[PDB]
Design a protein around this ligand. Structure first.
Ligand code: POV
Ligand code: POV
Ligand code: POV
Ligand code: POV
Ligand code: POV
Ligand code: POV
Ligand code: POV
Ligand code: Y01
Ligand code: Y01
Ligand code: LPE
Ligand code: LPE
Ligand code: LPE
Ligand code: LPE
Ligand SMILES: *[C@@H]1O[C@H](CO)[C@@H](O[C@@H]2O[C@H](CO)[C@@H](O)[C@H](O)[C@H]2NC(C)=O)[C@H](O)[C@H]1NC(C)=O
Ligand SMILES: *[C@@H]1O[C@H](CO)[C@@H](O[C@@H]2O[C@H](CO)[C@@H](O)[C@H](O)[C@H]2NC(C)=O)[C@H](O)[C@H]1NC(C)=O
Ligand code: CL
Ligand code: CL
Ligand code: CL
Ligand code: CL
Ligand code: NA
Ligand code: NA
Ligand code: NA
Ligand code: NA
Lengths: 469, 469
């Protein structure tokens, strides 16, 4: 069908690490208004790309084809090959991002039980490489039950959302109030409406580059093609509904975490305001909490802007949100891993590039891209060695923005030149909308960082001109 | 011929304002080694572009001449039309830069002799507007004295160079020693071999963006291909010889000004060393001068890094170098203005763009582009309103780097796709050298500043795709 076929597995790929780990932090540094602006600006790009993908899907009656097959048969081989290569690399790095998020969650779990391995960052590296190896092992042999693991992942994420909302509704406990979360309060909402840039990554585009991986994952709907009853109707509805619902979830979580947790807090339970005259400051002082020492000293360990795991603390039952993080990360990383490998294998089936034709060999009876799986695993491990979401996320934002700009401009190019095999039937496709989407995607790509955007653009130009020549 | 027709024409357009006003200051902030590296890196781009230009001039046989005509007939309507518009805009801004340099020289002359008009920056604006109006009046009516003007300008620049080199060897007087000039000394050479990096523009690429317009002007030989004797053998040798000799002049001036003047000095003549047990701190102490007061407070008025007219101070007779600055700036500004107007008119006569076609008609009997002259004058005035050379220069570096990258990549594209017309006979043209030149030009363009490079590439892509579609 369309619901479970497209929208449920597009949500599972869109929801990932930044939903649970960095969205509260983005809402802390930027304002609620600025976080909403970031979310809507990412969703504009992803929705224009979704319209382009819907136009691609409703083009002809292409059967049994992945993302690369659809794009390269509806559009030209010159643009299709570059789109496939950039998309495969972006998914390979997204594997590293989601594995790093899962490893960070496991490392925090280990720390809370007081059993760390070596040290914060190296523990993340070890857990991430072990996780990604287990992910590769599952992807190679044992993916038959991923059709039933999808329901478990979706139900786990739903339970995590419900638990977070229920815990947010609960009035504060002493420990939670000490950690910064009191409750829905107008004063905290007004305080968090305005930006507060507090680090090296504190900037509007610095937070856009970290958030934007939250919006990617719409092309996961494209590679379903061939397992759908009616792609021309299933693909657009599923993709656009998933984009809309994940956008609603991001906005709701941002506006609800910005209205109940203060930016600065100290995990010390003694900071409860002592009776007397006092010189206590801060918004929390009105709720009996004197977090004055850490706020001025800039040595706070908790709060929205300091604690990277505030959704877990706020929720009524912390392990449920940890399970939700595990489900979201292991769904998104697996989807990216088995998307990059399949796109790369299909691309290597087409003798379009000189050196990448070795990775196009299948293994077993399902012709699975074992060589592509190993290359994606190697790239994922290499980017995992970084072991920092705030550094890996800007790379993935750059490469997914490049892929989306490429898709939008390729659709525009096919429309404006009146390509022989480009007669999309999607009602809401406009070539000028696609051009606007590609232009804004490139502008944002250069705005996040200029050198990586230039590298991606140069790679795209090299591939496109090589196929042209 | 090739000497006066081509090489001297390219000489007078390459030699400009940065040679007299900012090269000693670039040598002060970046040191002699990095200034030479900047000069050689700019000359690499300009010589690789000159090889492509020489290949264009030897391709087929064109009798009418003109930069845009040659490039478009040898390379195609799309690439040729993009080049003929970016180059025209770059030449229009070059008029603003050279007029601003002339206005700055006149403002300094007014300050030293007489009284200023309104304000040191507003005086630059007023003098620049008046001088560019006079240049426009000369261009519209009175363009028959050009051979005499070329001879006078070349002779005055030769006299300025000779007088500077003669006064540099002269042992320093009390005033010159106070201002920081101590003839030739190894200690000053060693001290100035290393960077200083003061001010907001202290940067390797910040200095490259200001120096680079000193290397542009290599397209003056191709402008008169029709009016030559044998372009296929005159344009290449003339362009390459002009590039080589101007490179030699820049390297020599940088090396001798680095080894003569200290970075920090005070115009006060009382700053001679007192005969006692003092606390003298600078290198000039060994030469008998005490510049500690301003050097420690960063309030020195003179020196290599503080005085923009130290080249005139060092020389034997300042008025000769003032005349040399006037000649160089006026020759370069006139060449840029007439080249922009003539390229724009020829581009507009070929109906490749919708609205520019209005600036395509000539006036009088020789069909001068009066509308093109007025548009170039308007752009020049708009950029003159910015009365800072260090602000206009990075813009011209960006646009001339874009033009040179476009020419190089257009030649490479015509070579690789085996274009029909494209059959260059130049012995030293290689398509891979052109590709390297285009790539490094784009990389440098983005390294100077990323947003202006992005705007230039966006305009280039817009024009190219408009002609393609
Ligand atoms: C893309 C962005 C930069 C990054 C580039 C990354 C790649 C760089 C490396 C490139 C060299 C690639 C290998 C060449 C050697 C192997 C042969 C081969 O590949 O086939 C062909 C090359 O293949 C191509 O077409 C490459 C095209 C690169 C385009 C780069 C454009 C940069 C524009 C920047 C400015 C844009 C405009 C700016 C305007 C302001 C060559 O075939 P051949 O050998 O000629 O055939 C026989 C002839 N011969 C043997 C006698 C010679
Ligand atoms: C690697 C990942 C990223 C890849 C993509 C990277 C970005 C690539 C972006 C490329 C953008 C290229 C835009 C120009 C070329 C297409 C439009 C055009 O001008 O041709 C058209 C002329 O149209 C006009 O000239 C009138 C003005 C409207 C169109 C141009 C607006 C955008 C201008 C530039 C703005 C962007 C400047 C910066 C970007 C260059 C020809 O067709 P038409 O006559 O319009 O026909 C109308 C048909 N209709 C009647 C059905 C409507
Ligand atoms: C979904 C669309 C995208 C956007 C959605 C964004 C939606 C949310 C956006 C913003 C919510 C944030 C604004 C309200 C918070 C600040 C104001 C406030 O509430 O203050 C009051 C509490 O309010 C309550 O008791 C309940 C409030 C929230 C109920 C649940 C929120 C929706 C949860 C469902 C998830 C969302 C729905 C999804 C459902 C599918 C308390 O005020 P005070 O300061 O204590 O009073 C002062 C008195 N004193 C001074 C005397 C002490
Ligand atoms: C096959 C083709 C491509 C593959 C090539 C791979 C090349 C591999 C090379 C490098 C790969 C690794 C990059 C460096 C990692 C740097 C990390 C870093 O911190 O950088 C820092 C700087 O860094 C730079 O600014 C330099 C950027 C390098 C140029 C990229 C060349 C490739 C373009 C391809 C061709 C294009 C053609 C275009 C066509 C239209 C960021 O710092 P900043 O912000 O500058 O700091 C200023 C601070 N301030 C302002 C506050 C004072
Ligand atoms: C084709 C050209 C290729 C080259 C281009 C670049 C060429 C120019 C490049 C470099 C030349 C300039 C830099 C080196 C010399 C100054 C630095 C120095 O070392 O000071 C020393 C040398 O000083 C002199 O040599 C003075 C006499 C010649 C000065 C230069 C004349 C013009 C050179 C260009 C003419 C035009 C060239 C082009 C014509 C077309 C003096 O120091 P000292 O204190 O006396 O030493 C005492 C040491 N002790 C105290 C320990 C005992
Ligand atoms: C393909 C060819 C056509 C298209 C080309 C691509 C289009 C764009 C082409 C060129 C634009 C490139 C960027 C320009 C702005 C740079 C920033 C700047 O210098 O601001 C200056 C504004 O100076 C003033 O005081 C007001 C006068 C500004 C006149 C120029 C405005 C642009 C108009 C003509 C351009 C459009 C002409 C369009 C013609 C069709 C002030 O300087 P600052 O940086 O703020 O401060 C620096 C420190 N400082 C204070 C000491 C100085
Ligand atoms: C057809 C038309 C196309 C052209 C449209 C014209 C648009 C005209 C819009 C603006 C022109 C006028 C001047 C703009 C700003 C000047 C002021 C300034 O100093 O900016 C500041 C930066 O901020 C930016 O980065 C601006 C970036 C957006 C401009 C590029 C968008 C246009 C791209 C085109 C589309 C391409 C798609 C194609 C790619 C393949 C300078 O800051 P910095 O120092 O440099 O940054 C670091 C500063 N720091 C010191 C704090 C660290
Ligand atoms: C980063 C941001 C600034 C991106 C900017 C995108 C623009 C370059 C695009 C977006 C929508 C485009 C427009 C969409 C619709 C049209 C109408 C079109 O005219 C038609 O022939 C059909 C419509 C009509 O009848 O006018 C001409 C192109 C134009 C103006 C397009 C010009 C280019 C626009 C403004
Ligand atoms: C001093 C340095 C730092 C200046 C900048 C480097 C250039 C001098 C280099 C960089 C890339 C080089 C080019 C890269 C590739 C080629 C292809 C090469 O092709 C051939 O050999 C063609 C003849 C044949 O072998 O059949 C000729 C040299 C050339 C143009 C190179 C010439 C020298 C270039 C421009
Ligand atoms: C906050 C910073 C960003 C602010 C943007 C605000 C929020 C945007 C969130 C994204 C929504 C953007 C979606 C894309 C909108 C532009 C895209 C608009 O949709 C394209 C339109 O073409 C669709 O309509 P058609 O082209 O066919 O014409 C209509 C067909 N009917 C109606 C005749 C049947
Ligand atoms: C703030 C915490 C974030 C939580 C806020 C946002 C809520 C998260 C977003 C989740 C929104 C919900 C997504 C789930 C899908 C909603 C959107 C549903 O999509 C359309 C359905 O009608 C299709 O479903 P079915 O054909 O299965 O019919 C269902 C009815 N029967 C068949 C079972 C009887
Ligand atoms: C100080 C560092 C300097 C860096 C600058 C280097 C600058 C560029 C190289 C410089 C000097 C050039 C040396 C001499 C001038 C070129 C001299 C070589 O060119 C002779 C030209 O007339 C024509 O080239 P050809 O003679 O090979 O053939 C012409 C075309 N037809 C007849 C076959 C059709
Ligand atoms: C096949 C193509 C492959 C790539 C080819 C070449 C790649 C090598 C290029 C990298 C060399 C550059 C290394 C970067 C050096 C350190 C890079 C340090 O970054 C500084 C520059 O990005 C910016 O300089 P500015 O911002 O000062 O310029 C003027 C703007 N202001 C003054 C107004 C602020
Ligand atoms: C709340 O706690 C803060 C912690 O800084 C108190 O601030 C300090 O108070 C003591 C005096 O009793 C001294 O350390 C200084 O007066 C303050 N130092 C700093 C670092 O601010 C504050 O007095 C407390 N206010 C109450 C009682 O609510
Ligand atoms: C070189 O100049 C410095 C700076 O003026 C002199 O050092 C100062 O000497 C006078 C008188 O002793 C006082 O202003 C201070 O004691 C010194 N420092 C400053 C910052 O002024 C130094 O004496 C001079 N050396 C000479 C003339 O040989
Ligand atoms: Cl995510
Ligand atoms: Cl995606
Ligand atoms: Cl110059
Ligand atoms: Cl030039
Ligand atoms: Na995602
Ligand atoms: Na997920
Ligand atoms: Na010049
Ligand atoms: Na000149």
């Amino acid at each position: 069908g369309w619901v479970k076929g497209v929208m449920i597995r597009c949500m599972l790929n869109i929801w990932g690490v930044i939903l649970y780990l960095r969205l509260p932090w983005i809402t802390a540094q930027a304002g609620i208004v600025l976080t909403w602006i970031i979310i809507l600006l990412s969703v504009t790009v992803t929705s224009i790309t979704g319209l382009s993908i819907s136009a691609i899907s409703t083009n002809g009656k292409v059967k049994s084809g992945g993302t690369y097959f659809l794009i390269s048969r509806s559009l030209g081989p010159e643009l299709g090959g570059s789109i496939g290569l950039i998309f495969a690399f972006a998914n390979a790095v997204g594997v590293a991002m989601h594995t790093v998020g899962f490893a960070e969650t496991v490392r925090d779990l280990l720390q809370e039980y007081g059993a760390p391995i070596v040290d914060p960052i190296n523990d993340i590296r070890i857990i991430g490489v072990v996780s990604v190896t287990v992910l590769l092992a599952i992807s190679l042999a044992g993916m038959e039950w991923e059709s039933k693991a999808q329901v478990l992942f979706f139900l786990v994420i739903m339970v995590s959302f419900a638990n977070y909302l229920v815990g947010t509704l609960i009035p504060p406990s002493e420990d939670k109030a000490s950690k910064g979360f009191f409750s829905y309060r107008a004063d905290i909402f007004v305080q968090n409406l305005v930006p507060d840039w507090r680090g090296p990554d504190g900037t509007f585009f610095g937070m856009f580059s970290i958030f934007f991986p939250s919006a990617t994952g719409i092309l996961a709907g494209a590679n379903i093609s061939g397992d759908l009853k009616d792609p021309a109707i299933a693909i657009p509805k599923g993709t656009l509904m998933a984009i809309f619902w994940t956008t609603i979830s991001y906005l709701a979580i941002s506006a609800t975490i910005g209205s109940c947790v203060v930016r600065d807090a100290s995990g010390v339970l003694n900071d409860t305001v002592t009776p007397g005259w006092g010189a206590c400051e801060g918004l929390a002082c009105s709720y009996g909490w004197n977090f004055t020492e850490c706020t001025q000293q800039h040595s706070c360990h908790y709060g929205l802007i300091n604690y990277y795991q505030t959704m877990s603390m706020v929720s009524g039952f912390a392990p449920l949100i940890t399970a939700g993080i595990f489900g979201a990360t292991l769904s998104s990383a697996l989807a990216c891993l088995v998307s990059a490998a399949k796109v790369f294998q299909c691309l290597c089936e087409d003798q379009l590039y000189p050196l990448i034709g070795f990775f196009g060999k299948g293994y077993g009876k399902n012709k699975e891209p074992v060589r592509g799986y190993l290359l994606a695993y190697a790239i994922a491990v290499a980017f995992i060695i970084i072991a920092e979401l705030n550094t890996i996320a800007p790379i993935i934002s750059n490469f997914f923005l490049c892929s989306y700009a490429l898709i939008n401009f390729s659709c525009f190019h096919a429309s404006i030149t009146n390509s022989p095999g480009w007669r999309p039937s999607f009602q809401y496709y406009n070539k000028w909308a696609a051009l606007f989407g590609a232009i804004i995607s490139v502008v944002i790509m250069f705005l996040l960082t200029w050198w990586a955007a230039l590298i991606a653009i140069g790679v795209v130009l090299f591939l496109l001109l090589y196929v042209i020549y």
